[PDB]
Structures are given as C-alpha cells and as structure tokens.
C-alpha cells in the first residue's frame, strides 16, 4: 500500500515486462531501439531506463544466455552468449543459459563432473529431476536426451555417472571462453533499484 513499496513492485514488474519483451524480439530476429522500449514497455517510467534495461539485460545474459549487443546509435540486437547455435525453441523460453551453466559446472570440476555434482548445482537454482521446471522443462530428459543427440554433452557410466563436454560444445566454445564468461559476470556492476527520492532527483 505504501507508495515506495508499490514503486519497487512496479520496477520489478517492468524488469520482467522488458525481459519478456526482448525474448519476443530475439525470437523474431529483429532489432530493438531505445525508442521502442520506452514507447512500448516502460512508457511511464522512461527515465528509469538505465536501471530497468540494465536489470533486464542482466536477466537475459544469465537466465537464457541472450546478450543485448549495441550496434552503436542506440540500436541493439539479440544474440546468444558465447555464440552458440542452440536455444531450444522448436519460440518461448531459451534454454541456452542453462546449457552454459551446465558447461561451466563441468569446466570447473575438470575434464568430467559427476552426475551428483551436476544435480547439486541445478538443485540450488530450482531445477529438479522429476519436476518440469516451467521455463526449462524436464531437466533429466533435457540434460540427457536433448543435449546428447545435439552433441553438446556426453553421458557414460563410472569407469555412478558423469557428464563431459561433447564435440559440438568444444566446437562452438572453449573451456577458457566459458570460464571467462563466469569471471566477467561474477564481476559485473550490480544494479540497485532506486528509491523514490533518487528517481525524482534525476529530472
């Protein structure tokens, strides 16, 4: 009921309304300009663009592995992170960012990571064997079936189970390119929502 309390609910909802807008833009393979997002998403809170865009771009790079690339002006185009070819749209929710998360988890346990170690990373993010996550789908089936035939992963016995990078994963990115995407994002500038006094000062 409080105004500043209803403010961050409006910002948090414009973050999820811009993100779900850009996903509609990436699926159509169009270009996005700053004028479009102002007029057709955050028409009311335009001067908040550096923070709703910054918190939506960051909510794409890491959730769906989609990168907002400014062509440089004020024009942006949507591509996949580390330049992969798979997203999972066959056009709702890209599964690229979860792939890139699984890859970097093996990249840190060495050549191969145990099935146990993989699930434990996936369990902390709300994705559980035998539970259809809404955005990602069934995890066990998508990890095993989907990414084995796509040649992104390997799944073999003990000599327990384990995961290794596949031929297509090594062809489109590297251990060093993933481990630096993890470092660049772990060292990002963290955006904080503005108060009402702050947001009004910028005018």
């Amino acid at each position: 009921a409080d105004a500043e309390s209803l403010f961050r609910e409006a910002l948090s909802n414009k973050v999820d309304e811009l993100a779900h807008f850009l996903l509609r833009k990436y699926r159509a393979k169009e270009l996005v300009t700053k004028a479009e997002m102002l007029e057709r998403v955050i028409k009311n809170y335009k001067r908040c663009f550096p923070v709703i865009f910054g918190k939506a771009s960051e909510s794409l790079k890491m959730i769906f592995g989609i990168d907002v690339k400014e062509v440089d002006s004020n024009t942006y185009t949507l591509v996949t992170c580390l330049g992969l070819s798979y997203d999972g749209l066959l056009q709702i929710f890209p599964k690229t960012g979860l792939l890139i998360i699984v890859l970097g988890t093996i990249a840190m346990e060495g050549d191969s990571a145990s099935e146990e170690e993989i699930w434990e990373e996936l369990g902390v993010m709300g994705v559980y064997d035998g539970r259809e996550h809404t955005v990602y789908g069934e995890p066990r089936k998508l990890l095993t079936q989907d990414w084995v035939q796509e040649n992104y992963l390997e799944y073999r016995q003990v000599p327990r189970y384990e995961f290794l990078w596949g031929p297509r994963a090594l062809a489109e990115t590297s251990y060093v390119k993933v481990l630096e995407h993890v470092v660049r994002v772990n060292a990002r500038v963290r955006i904080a929502y503005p108060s009402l006094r702050e947001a009004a000062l910028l005018e």
């Binding site: 890491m62 998360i101 993890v182 994002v185």
Partner: peptide, 7 residues
Amino acid sequence: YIRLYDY
C-alpha cells in the same frame, strides 16, 4: 539461486 555467478 545460481551459485556459478551469484544471482
């Protein structure tokens, strides 16, 4: 929660 990049 993703414990790769803390977000």
